């Protein structure tokens, strides 16, 4: 029942990242260790991708005997998306994470066939032309503290929501050591 569609916002802080999704359960953001992925589009394809990536990351952890890094996960997602070249999922994914060895935050985005779109400031998925990309660009400031980044992303979500009804948001703030999950039941 509906569910299809949505918005995902990824932003890079000083030594942290922020990934946020909307919400009416069914959450568009899933974690595979210390890497987070948010998918917009058909709910069926989102669930299929989540299950496939959980499968592949579990096998990777069992073999490599270590967690999977954001860059390797980005390459894996790109290849998996390109596999369905002529039957592609109606999805747009966004990957966020912190490299556990160097600490540099990583954010990337993909099209429906795995073309990697890595941005150094912020990434918007689902809707990037109506009222989200411009407001995120206006409200973005590089090298922000985790609290400042959280406030910025919450303000961006509120501005997008205004442009009232039943609205919620899930925000993940990722550091090298701990991850904070918050809701926006406003």
């Amino acid at each position: 029942s509906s569910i299809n569609g949505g918005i995902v916002v990824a932003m890079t802080g000083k030594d942290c990242v922020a990934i946020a999704c909307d919400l009416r359960k069914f959450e568009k953001i899933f974690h595979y260790g210390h890497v987070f992925l948010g998918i917009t589009g058909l709910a069926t394809d989102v669930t299929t991708l989540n299950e496939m990536f959980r499968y592949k990351t579990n096998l990777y952890k069992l073999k490599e005997e270590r967690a999977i890094e954001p860059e390797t996960f980005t390459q894996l997602v790109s290849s998996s998306l390109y596999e369905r070249r002529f039957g592609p999922y109606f999805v747009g994914p966004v990957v966020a994470g912190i490299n556990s060895k160097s600490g540099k935050p990583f954010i990337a985005g993909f099209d429906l066939i795995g073309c990697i779109d890595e941005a150094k400031d912020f990434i918007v998925s689902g809707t990037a032309s109506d009222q989200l990309f411009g407001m995120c660009e206006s409200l973005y400031e590089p090298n922000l503290e985790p609290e400042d980044l959280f406030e910025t992303i919450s303000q961006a979500l509120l501005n997008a929501a205004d442009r009232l009804s039943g609205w919620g948001a899930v925000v993940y703030i990722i550091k090298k050591d701990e991850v904070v999950k918050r809701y926006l039941k406003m």
């Binding site: 390109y82 596999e83 369905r84 070249r85 002529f86 039957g87 592609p88 999922y89 109606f90």
Partner: peptide, 9 residues
């Protein structure tokens, strides 16, 4: 390369 979900698409 897979041709699955062509008819569905």
């Amino acid at each position: 390369l897979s041709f699955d979900n062509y008819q569905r698409n």
